[PDB]
C-alpha cells in the first residue's frame, strides 16, 4: 500500500519565474535548489 515505500528523499526548493500575462500558474523553472540538510522543524 506504498509507492517508493522504502527510500530517503532530500527536500528541494523549486523556483519558478513569475507569471507574465493573464495567468496564475508559475512559469517555467529557472533553478531547482536541493537542500544539504532537511529542516529540523517546520512551522506552519
Amino acid at each position: 500500500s506504498k509507492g517508493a515505500g522504502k527510500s530517503l528523499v532530500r527536500a528541494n526548493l523549486a523556483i519558478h519565474e513569475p507569471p507574465t500575462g493573464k495567468s496564475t500558474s508559475p512559469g517555467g523553472l529557472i533553478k531547482r535548489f536541493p537542500f544539504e540538510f532537511n529542516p529540523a522543524q517546520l512551522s506552519i
Binding site: 528523499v9 532530500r10 527536500a11 540538510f37 532537511n38 529542516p39 529540523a40 522543524q41 517546520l42
Partner: protein
C-alpha cells in the same frame, strides 16, 4: 624491536623560556579539543550529524616546589600593567634512559593563575606553588 621502549609518567622535562622561570616539576591537563556542532537531519532518524568546527586548547597547571626563585613568577604576572612577554614553553616525556618519547612545545604562553603554597602547621609536605599557563598552539 629491541623490546620496544614504552613511555612512562615519571621521567619528564618541564621548562619555560624567556623570563627566568626555570624548570618546573609537574604538568597536568595538557589537552586539545575540537568544538563539534550537532545538526539533526529532519527526515532521517537514527543518527545526528557530527560536523567539525574549530579546535580549542585548554589551560595547563604547572607545579613546582617553592624556592626563592618564586619572585620571578610574581614579577612576570604583575608585569601585565607595563607590558607582558610570551616566551615559548616545552613539555616533554622521557623514558628512564633520558631519550625522547614525545616532545611538545607551547607556541605562546600567558599566566592565568598562581595558587601559592598551602601553609599548614600539621601536614608534613612541601610547598607546591601552582602556575597556570594559557596556550596558543603546538610547535612543529
Amino acid at each position: 624491536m629491541t623490546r620496544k621502549d614504552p613511555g612512562s609518567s615519571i621521567w619528564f622535562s618541564l621548562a619555560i623560556d624567556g623570563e627566568s622561570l626555570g624548570y618546573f616539576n609537574g604538568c597536568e591537563g595538557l589537552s586539545t579539543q575540537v568544538e563539534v556542532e550537532q545538526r539533526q537531519e529532519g527526515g532521517n532518524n537514527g543518527f545526528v550529524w557530527q560536523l567539525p568546527t574549530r579546535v580549542t586548547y585548554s589551560n595547563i597547571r604547572l607545579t613546582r616546589p617553592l624556592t626563592p626563585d618564586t619572585a620571578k613568577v610574581a614579577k612576570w604576572i604583575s608585569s601585565v600593567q607595563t607590558g607582558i612577554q610570551r616566551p615559548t614553553a616545552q613539555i616533554s616525556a622521557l623514558r628512564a634512559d633520558g631519550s625522547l618519547v614525545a616532545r611538545w612545545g607551547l607556541i605562546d604562553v600567558l599566566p592565568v593563575s598562581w595558587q601559592g603554597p598551602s601553609l599548614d602547621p600539621g601536614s608534613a609536605s612541601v610547598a607546591n606553588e601552582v602556575l597556570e599557563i594559557a596556550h596558543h598552539g603546538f610547535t612543529d
